[PDB]
Structure formats: C-alpha cells, structure tokens
C-alpha cells in the first residue's frame, strides 16, 4: 500500500535526521561550561504585590518601557499596572470572561487578549477620548486562543488550540499567513528578537520554528515527552527554552538543530507553565504547578534560587526588557515583582 | 511640579478603577457559574432551553445568564472546541458546580460517559468542584427496558447480580426492571464519585422528572447545598 511506503519513507527521513544530529553532537553544554564559576545563591524579594484582580490570572506581558504591564484574569478584566507606583492605569472589561492570553504592543498603543471565545480582541489604549475600546475583533480561529504577540502596531501572531498558528493583518482583520503542521493544541509562542522568526510549543511534545515571511516550518524539535506549555527565545535568538508537563525545562539550539541541556530535579514532579530568560540569558526562570518559580543556571543547570510566596499555581512569568525585574502572576489573583 | 500633578492624577484614576473593581466584585462573588458537560446525545441543549424559558435571560461558548429567586446564575456550555479538553478544562477550576448530563437510554455509549465522568472527577484542577449528575432520557430508558430487545447485562456483566437498593423511591406506575436499571446506572456513576472524593467534593445524581420544573429546583438546591458546605468548610466547621 502507498501509506506503508510513505510511513517507511518518513521513518527513513527521521532516522537520517537523527543520525545527522548525533554526528553533529561532538560535545555537550555541560562538558564545555564545566570550567566556569557557578552563579551565587540568587535571592529575589517581592518589591511590589499588585492586587485588584478577582479571579485567577492567566497571562501577563511587560511593556517595552519596562514600567507598565498588562495582565488578564478569568473574571473578564484587563488591568494595566504602573509597576513603579503600583497604581492602576486601565481596567478593560471583556465580553468573554474566559481569557487565556494577553499581550502588550511594542509601542504601548494597543493591547490584545483572547481565550475560549476563539477571538483575538485588540484594544486601543491611547485613543483621542482616553477611553479604552475594542478596535478590531480578529476572528477565524476554530480553537481557543492561547498566546498572542505583536509584531508591530498592524501585525500580530496568535497561536490557537486548533493546532494552527496565524499572522494577522489588524487593519483588514484577515489572516495574512497560516502556520500549520502541529498535531496538538498550540500553547505557547515566542518571537525572535529580529521578529523574522518565532517558535511555538504545542501539546504534541514538539516545538516548531516558523518563518514569518514565508509561512513554513524551518525546523522541528522533539526532545520533550509531554505537552509543552511555555516557550521563550534566548536573548541571542539562536536558542530557546521550553516548559512541559513532564516537569522538565529543555534548551534547544537552532543552528545545532538539537537539544542542548535539560533542567530537571528528582524532587520536582509538577508541570511547568511559564519560562523566561534573564536579560543576558544566564538565568532561566520557570514557573511550576507547586506554586513556586525556580531560577535555573542556563549554562550549568544548577537551581540557583526559588521565588516562593504565591498561594496558588504560577501561570505567567515575564522579565522586563531592561532585565530590571521579573513579574510573576499566579492563580490567587495576585501579581508580584522580584529583583 | 509636573510630577506632583501626574502622581495625583494617577492616584485619582487608581481610586476610580478600584471603586469600579469593588463594585464588580460585589456582583461576581454573588453569581454562581455552572459548567455544562456531556456528550452529543446527552441532552444539554434541552436543559439550557428549559432553564432559559423558565427564567428569561441571555460562538465558542453557549453562555446564558439568568436570575432565579433573586440569585444570579451563569450556565455555559463549551462548544466549538476540538475533541481534546485537557487544556481548556483547566479554566473551570473555580466554577461552582459541573452539570454533567448522561443519556441513560444509550447503553452503547454509557461506558464513554462513565470514563468522561471519571476523568473529570479525578482531574488535578477539577478536584474540589462538585458535580450535579443529570441522568437524562428516563422515558426512553423505560421504553428500552420494557421492550426487552436490548439488555444491560450485554454491555455490563455486573448487572446480573445487581439488586435494587433499599433507599429507592417507588415512583407510581414503575416497573421493577425500570427502577432496577435506573438505580444500577446511578450507582455505577456514584461509585466513581465515592471512590476518590474523600469529602473534597460531592455528586448529586437526579433522574430527570420528564419535562418538569423540578430539574431547575434540583439545580438550585444543589448549588445552595454546595455554597452552604463551602461556607462551613471556610469557617472550619466541616
């Protein structure tokens, strides 16, 4: 049968790819960074405790100015915090209270949110009248929205639970490009610093690197063993890290096209919800289901510290653009800032 | 001097935002959100339609907001998603109750309903949420039992030795076979709830009273009991 021949060809191609990757791995990251001195005991403290949310916080996103941030809760609100003064700038009620994601535009002009309504709503913050109102209702996804990131004021990449990603032209409200190839619900999405590429981790234990312009999957990484919930690009853009239900963080390299290091501990058995690198990429903060966020040595895989204090499951994580602080939101409707 | 004015404006805006937030919380904490789950043939649509017709109210969610005895309610059915639910089911980890609907007259797909109930009950996040079990389509179950063409023991070998429980209500004009089948299905669903509940959450089975308002009353009573038990547990008295 033709299906058997196609499956055999796919297996042969996978074997060839694995053989090439094995031949390409002449050493390991641990075997090379063994001579560098470890980071000292990392101790962050809760500088601010942003409170005012009703239900569990599901996502957050820092601003480019590294002062304002936006968070989305499951009670149907979008609160924009002035992190320096703990004040609230905006509180946008949402048509659907089931919201899984939120984003901050690089210019700070708009915000985006989405969820079980399968719609990416975009709200204009700095309008003429000063009242935040929905500007575009991006529809076309047949699954829940899980992540959204602004390319610029007129473009946004959204990942959905219909196993497809998309690039939206906000002005026309239409899908410029569709990224298909995932066999499971896409859960995370991370833009490269150059914005020309992005990665997405789905519930099929695979992360695919996509091309924004051409709309094709350049590379696929299959080092995990469970659904991938988080993904974050390295500051260099040549690597990224992933979190998964199998209680492991894994660093993949784009040029080597294979996994470089794993960050797991015997006593850690809960899933990972959010990951984010430091400004220099030396630290890898990762939220967990055990209400704790662990700081990992991105070069030596030593757990440098722990950010304890959240009463419920940590769900979102984010490091400012200048690396000044890291903000963690969890399911007890509380946001915290650490440095 | 600009900084002082900017900070004063920020504080005033934050005060307005917090006032609106507390006004919204006063309503959010007084509203009960119920998540409707089931199968294609379970019959959630008729329940939603009856509850909307009895009390006037109300894409990817079949939202419905109504008011029953000056108590706010919110019934939503998650349609339009894919068959995989292990990720979006985590949103409803703070709902008041889960209204699980079963087709009692469909023996072929009864094990699928049992497996779905087991998965919902044993979920890590859905482990503190009580389930209101709705055993729909009782007239069809009675017709199937009385016909005799299809036997429960064909799909469930444990029905041969099953006996009607002592605490069974003898509805007027009820054949012993019909009530035996009803209570066998109810006990099959209750074993999963009692096997791992450990008092964190409860199950409230209810054979549908044909097409009557009694189902809405049962939902209201179950929600009231859940709220009472939640208050007792928060006070440390249960």
């Amino acid at each position: 049968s033709e299906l058997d021949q196609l499956r055999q060809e796919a297996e042969q191609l996978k074997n060839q790819i694995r053989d090439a990757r094995k031949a390409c791995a002449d050493a390991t990251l641990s075997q090379i960074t063994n001579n560098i001195d470890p980071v000292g005991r990392i101790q962050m403290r809760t500088r601010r405790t942003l409170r005012g949310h009703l239900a569990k916080i599901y996502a957050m996103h820092w601003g480019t100015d590294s002062r304002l941030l936006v968070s989305a809760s499951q009670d149907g609100k979008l609160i924009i915090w002035d992190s320096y003064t703990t004040n609230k700038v905006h509180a946008i009620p949402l048509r659907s209270s089931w919201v899984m994601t939120c984003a901050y535009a690089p210019s700070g002009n708009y915000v985006a949110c989405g969820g079980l309504d399968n719609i990416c709503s975009i709200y204009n913050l700095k309008t003429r009248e000063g009242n935040v109102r929905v500007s575009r209702e991006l529809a076309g996804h047949t699954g829940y929205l899980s992540c959204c990131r602004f390319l610029d004021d007129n473009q946004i990449v959204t990942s959905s639970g219909d196993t497809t990603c998309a690039l939206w032209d906000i002005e026309t409200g239409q899908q410029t490009t569709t990224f298909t190839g995932h066999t499971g619900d896409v859960m995370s999405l991370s833009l490269a610093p150059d914005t020309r590429l992005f990665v997405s981790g789905a519930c099929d234990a695979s992360a695919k690197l996509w091309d924004v312009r051409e709309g094709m999957c350049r590379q696929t990484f299959t080092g995990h063993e469970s659904d991938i919930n988080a993904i974050c690009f390295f500051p260099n853009g040549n690597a990224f890290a992933t979190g998964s239900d199998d209680a492991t963080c894994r660093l993949f390299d784009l040029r080597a096209d294979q996994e470089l290091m794993t960050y797991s501990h015997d006593n850690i058995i809960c899933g990972i919800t959010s990951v984010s690198f430091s400004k220099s990429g030396r630290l890898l903060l990762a939220g967990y289901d055990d209400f704790n966020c662990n700081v990992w040595d991105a070069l030596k895989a030593d757990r440098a510290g722990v950010l304890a204090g959240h009463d419920n499951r940590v769900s979102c994580l984010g490091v400012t653009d200048d690396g000044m602080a890291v903000a963690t939101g969890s399911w007890d409707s509380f946001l915290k800032i650490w440095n | 001097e600009d900084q002082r004015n900017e900070e004063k404006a920020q504080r005033e805006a934050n005060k307005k935002i917090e006032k609106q937030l507390q006004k919204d919380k006063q309503v959010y904490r007084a509203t009960h959100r119920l998540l409707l789950l089931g199968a294609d043939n379970s019959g959630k649509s008729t329940i939603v339609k009856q509850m909307r017709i009895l009390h006037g109210g109300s894409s990817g969610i079949f939202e419905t907001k109504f008011q029953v005895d000056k108590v706010n309610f919110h019934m939503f059915d998650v349609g339009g998603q894919r068959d995989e639910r292990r990720k979006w089911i985590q949103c409803f980890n703070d709902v008041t109750a889960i209204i699980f609907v079963v087709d009692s007259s469909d023996y072929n797909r009864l094990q699928e309903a049992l497996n779905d109930f087991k998965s919902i009950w044993n979920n890590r996040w859905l482990r503190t949420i009580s389930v209101i079990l709705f055993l729909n389509k009782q007239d069809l179950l009675a017709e199937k039992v009385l016909a005799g063409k299809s036997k429960i023991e064909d799909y469930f070998p444990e029905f041969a030795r099953y006996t009607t429980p002592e605490d069974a209500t003898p509805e007027p004009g009820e054949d012993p076979r019909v009530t035996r089948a009803k209570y066998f299905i109810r006990d099959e669903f209750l074993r999963i709830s009692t096997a791992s509940g450990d008092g964190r959450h409860y199950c409230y089975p209810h054979f549908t009273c044909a097409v009557d308002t009694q189902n809405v009353k049962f939902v209201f009573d179950a929600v009231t009991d859940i709220i009472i038990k939640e208050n007792l547990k928060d006070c440390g008295l249960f």
């Epitope: 066999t183 499971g184 519930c203 099929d204 234990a205 063993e225 469970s226 659904d227 239900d245 199998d246 209680a247 058995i269 899933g271 | 894919r82 068959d83 995989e84 639910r85 292990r86 089911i89 699928e112 497996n115 087991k118 998965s119 919902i120 009950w121 044993n122 979920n123 890590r124 791992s196």
Partner: nanobody, 128 residues
C-alpha cells in the same frame, strides 16, 4: 520523540486467542499510566483497558472483562494485551495509548480522533 509501536494483530478464528505488544520509546515508561483503545469499522474510538504506573490498578470495559488481560513490564518498556475468547464484533484496530501527563491518576483525550501519544494501531480481525 514519543513513539508507540504495536504488533500481534492478524487473522483469528472466533473463539481464538491473541496477544498484543506496545514497544514504547522516547519517554520513561514507569511514570505514565497506559491504555488500550480500539476502533471498530464504522465506529469511533472506544476505550478498552488501562493500567497504573506500577500495575496495581487495572480496569476494563464490560464487553471485554473476563476475556482481555492488560499487563506492563517497566524493564522492557512494553505493554501487553492478551485477548481470549475473541468474538466477531471485536474486529477493530487496536491502539496503545498513554496518559498525557506523568504521575496523574486521570487520563484525558485518550480516545480523541487525533492524539499525539498514540500508536499507529494494529488491525485485529475475527472471522470463521
């Protein structure tokens, strides 16, 4: 990558016997609860059996209880399903499934039309 390969299916006369295997690779076997699923022609995917990580907890469907036996061996990373007293309606494609997350009692989306942690399946046919 997570990969499950099944074997053992084939022609079996009614009242015969069979044994299925599931060579699991790409993940630690002793951390996940395993499953067996089948798909009869013209019918949807139907759960058959499951087994705990250590093999202590085992459950089947009503139509296969007393005929099918599920077992696992964490040393060889394989899952077995011995099938006895086969009947013609058992003709189906049998898939070896895995729970999505480790250390988890409940199992979600095992019988979905698409599921990443599922094998290609082996056709089992029963006819005299």
């Amino acid at each position: 990558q997570v990969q499950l390969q099944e074997s053992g299916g084939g022609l079996v006369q009614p009242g015969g016997s069979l044994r299925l295997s599931c060579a699991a690779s790409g993940f630690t076997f002793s951390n996940y609860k395993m499953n067996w699923v089948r798909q009869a022609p013209g019918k949807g995917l139907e759960w058959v059996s499951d087994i705990s990580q250590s093999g202590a907890s085992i459950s089947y469907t009503g139509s296969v209880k007393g005929r099918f036996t599920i077992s696992r061996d964490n040393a060889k990373n394989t899952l077995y399903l011995q099938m006895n007293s086969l009947k013609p309606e058992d003709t189906a494609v049998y898939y070896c499934a895995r729970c999505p997350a480790p250390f988890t009692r409940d199992c979600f989306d095992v019988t979905s039309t698409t599921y990443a942690y599922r094998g290609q399946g082996t056709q089992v046919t029963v006819s005299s």
